[PDB]
Design a protein around this motif. Structure first.
Motif, PDB file in Angstrom:
ATOM      1  N   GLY A  71      -2.382 -10.568   0.257  1.00 56.84           N
ATOM      2  CA  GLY A  71      -3.185 -10.607   1.490  1.00 56.84           C
ATOM      3  C   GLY A  71      -3.139  -9.359   2.394  1.00 56.84           C
ATOM      4  N   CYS A  72      -2.183  -8.444   2.206  1.00 49.44           N
ATOM      5  CA  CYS A  72      -1.989  -7.253   3.039  1.00 49.44           C
ATOM      6  C   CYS A  72      -3.154  -6.242   2.982  1.00 49.44           C
ATOM      7  N   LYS A  73      -3.444  -5.638   4.141  1.00 46.42           N
ATOM      8  CA  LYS A  73      -4.453  -4.585   4.363  1.00 46.42           C
ATOM      9  C   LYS A  73      -3.811  -3.205   4.606  1.00 46.42           C
ATOM     10  N   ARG A  74      -2.477  -3.132   4.733  1.00 46.27           N
ATOM     11  CA  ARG A  74      -1.703  -1.899   4.971  1.00 46.27           C
ATOM     12  C   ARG A  74      -1.051  -1.345   3.696  1.00 46.27           C
ATOM     13  N   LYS A  75      -1.002  -2.131   2.610  1.00 42.37           N
ATOM     14  CA  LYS A  75      -0.395  -1.839   1.300  1.00 42.37           C
ATOM     15  C   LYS A  75      -0.394  -0.370   0.898  1.00 42.37           C
ATOM     16  N   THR A  76      -1.549   0.297   0.941  1.00 45.41           N
ATOM     17  CA  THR A  76      -1.726   1.717   0.590  1.00 45.41           C
ATOM     18  C   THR A  76      -2.281   2.592   1.720  1.00 45.41           C
ATOM     19  N   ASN A  77      -2.364   2.069   2.950  1.00 47.14           N
ATOM     20  CA  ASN A  77      -2.764   2.807   4.155  1.00 47.14           C
ATOM     21  C   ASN A  77      -1.518   3.516   4.727  1.00 47.14           C
ATOM     22  N   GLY A  78      -1.015   4.497   3.972  1.00 51.17           N
ATOM     23  CA  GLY A  78       0.247   5.208   4.225  1.00 51.17           C
ATOM     24  C   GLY A  78       1.475   4.502   3.621  1.00 51.17           C
ATOM     25  N   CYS A 119       2.731   0.163   2.989  1.00 53.95           N
ATOM     26  CA  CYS A 119       3.423  -0.971   3.611  1.00 53.95           C
ATOM     27  C   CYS A 119       4.812  -1.089   2.939  1.00 53.95           C
ATOM     28  N   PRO A 120       5.932  -1.220   3.678  1.00 52.46           N
ATOM     29  CA  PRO A 120       7.265  -1.258   3.077  1.00 52.46           C
ATOM     30  C   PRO A 120       7.496  -2.445   2.128  1.00 52.46           C
ATOM     31  N   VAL A 121       6.784  -3.564   2.300  1.00 51.69           N
ATOM     32  CA  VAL A 121       6.901  -4.728   1.409  1.00 51.69           C
ATOM     33  C   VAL A 121       6.172  -4.451   0.092  1.00 51.69           C
ATOM     34  N   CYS A 122       4.874  -4.148   0.155  1.00 52.17           N
ATOM     35  CA  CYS A 122       4.020  -3.869  -0.990  1.00 52.17           C
ATOM     36  C   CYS A 122       4.524  -2.666  -1.817  1.00 52.17           C
ATOM     37  N   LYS A 123       4.911  -1.559  -1.159  1.00 51.17           N
ATOM     38  CA  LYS A 123       5.415  -0.342  -1.820  1.00 51.17           C
ATOM     39  C   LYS A 123       6.658  -0.627  -2.673  1.00 51.17           C
ATOM     40  N   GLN A 124       7.646  -1.325  -2.112  1.00 50.48           N
ATOM     41  CA  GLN A 124       8.901  -1.620  -2.808  1.00 50.48           C
ATOM     42  C   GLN A 124       8.755  -2.721  -3.868  1.00 50.48           C
ATOM     43  N   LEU A 125       7.833  -3.678  -3.693  1.00 48.80           N
ATOM     44  CA  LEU A 125       7.522  -4.647  -4.753  1.00 48.80           C
ATOM     45  C   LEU A 125       6.986  -3.879  -5.980  1.00 48.80           C
ATOM     46  N   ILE A 126       6.111  -2.891  -5.752  1.00 48.38           N
ATOM     47  CA  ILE A 126       5.569  -2.015  -6.798  1.00 48.38           C
ATOM     48  C   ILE A 126       6.660  -1.109  -7.390  1.00 48.38           C
ATOM     49  N   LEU A 165      -8.935  -7.324 -10.333  1.00 49.86           N
ATOM     50  CA  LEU A 165      -8.718  -6.550  -9.109  1.00 49.86           C
ATOM     51  C   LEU A 165      -9.219  -5.113  -9.334  1.00 49.86           C
ATOM     52  N   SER A 166     -10.057  -4.591  -8.432  1.00 47.96           N
ATOM     53  CA  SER A 166     -10.597  -3.223  -8.518  1.00 47.96           C
ATOM     54  C   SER A 166      -9.460  -2.197  -8.589  1.00 47.96           C
ATOM     55  N   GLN A 167      -9.412  -1.386  -9.655  1.00 46.63           N
ATOM     56  CA  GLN A 167      -8.309  -0.438  -9.870  1.00 46.63           C
ATOM     57  C   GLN A 167      -8.243   0.745  -8.888  1.00 46.63           C
ATOM     58  N   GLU A 168      -9.195   0.872  -7.955  1.00 44.60           N
ATOM     59  CA  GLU A 168      -9.094   1.840  -6.845  1.00 44.60           C
ATOM     60  C   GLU A 168      -7.880   1.507  -5.953  1.00 44.60           C
ATOM     61  N   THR A 169      -7.454   0.233  -5.933  1.00 44.18           N
ATOM     62  CA  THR A 169      -6.201  -0.186  -5.295  1.00 44.18           C
ATOM     63  C   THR A 169      -5.048   0.309  -6.171  1.00 44.18           C
ATOM     64  N   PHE A 170      -5.056   0.005  -7.475  1.00 47.32           N
ATOM     65  CA  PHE A 170      -4.052   0.435  -8.464  1.00 47.32           C
ATOM     66  C   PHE A 170      -3.760   1.952  -8.472  1.00 47.32           C
TER      67      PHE A 170
END
Ligand code: ZN
Ligand code: ZN
Ligand code: ZN
Length: 158
Positions: free
Chosen positions: A45-52, A54-61, A111-116
């Motif tokens: 659900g996050c909108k900050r994941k790759t907007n510089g 997000c510490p949760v999304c970045k470390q899960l990856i 999921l659109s790979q532009e996120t990936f």
């Protein structure tokens, strides 16, 4: 040795991710399950994941990249593992393209790979897969103590 304790803490975190992904109970009594269920639901659900980053999304990856570096399965229970493994193969010449996971457009994930490709900007592109003299390219981005801090140090105004 502390290198073994670090690898073991990361292996427990990966087992926590797989448990939370196969688990069907929102009220599961495991702290490991609750950490990963809340994190995968946040990341979805996050909108900050790759907007510089997000510490949760970045470390899960970061954990999914570490897992995919050890993994060989074609239908693994980890959510990002297989397409991360395709992205890792593309850095080694074992896959094609950069703005696509393969030369074909119909084989892409739902999921659109532009996120990936932007998830690929949160982690270093070469350092993680660079030529190695002895096995250390795994512990390179993790610690035994950061495993809790990544998910429990929830952001706020102060
Ligand atoms: Zn569970
Ligand atoms: Zn996030
Ligand atoms: Zn896997």
């Amino acid at each position: 040795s502390p290198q073994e304790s670090r690898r073991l803490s990361i292996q427990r975190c990966i087992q926590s991710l797989v448990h939370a992904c196969q688990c069907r109970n929102a009220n599961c009594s495991l702290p490991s399950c609750q950490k990963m269920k809340r994190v995968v639901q946040h990341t979805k659900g996050c909108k900050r994941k790759t907007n510089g980053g997000c510490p949760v999304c970045k470390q899960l990856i970061a954990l999914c990249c570490y897992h995919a570096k050890h993994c060989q399965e074609n239908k693994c229970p980890v959510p990002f593992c297989l397409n991360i493994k395709h992205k890792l193969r593309q850095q080694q010449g074992s896959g094609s393209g950069s703005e696509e996971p393969q030369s074909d457009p119909s084989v892409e994930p739902p999921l659109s790979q532009e996120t990936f490709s932007d998830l690929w900007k949160l982690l270093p592109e070469n350092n993680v897969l660079s030529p190695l003299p002895s096995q250390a390219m795994d512990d390179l981005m993790l610690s035994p103590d950061d495993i809790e801090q990544w998910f429990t140090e929830d952001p706020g105004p102060d």
